[PDB]
Amino acid sequence: GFCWYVCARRNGARVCYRRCN
């Protein structure tokens, strides 16, 4: 029961989203 947001650099674009394990 834990979630967090991670940012990544795809095609020169910063993509951020929250996910859960």
**Which residues, at least 6 apart from 10, have a Cβ–Cβ distance to it below 8 Å?**
none
Which method was used?
A: NMR
Amino acid at 8: A
In contact, 15 and 7? CB cutoff 8 Å:
yes
Angle, CA 17 vertex, CA 5 and CA 13 arms, to 5°? 115
| Distances from the Cα of 7 to the Cα of 13, 14, 17, angstroms | 10, 6, 7
**Which residues, at least 6 apart from 11, have a Cβ–Cβ distance to it below 8 Å?**
none
Tokens of 8: 């990544």
Instruction: State the Cα–Cα distance between residues 17 and 7, nearest whole angstrom.
Output: 7
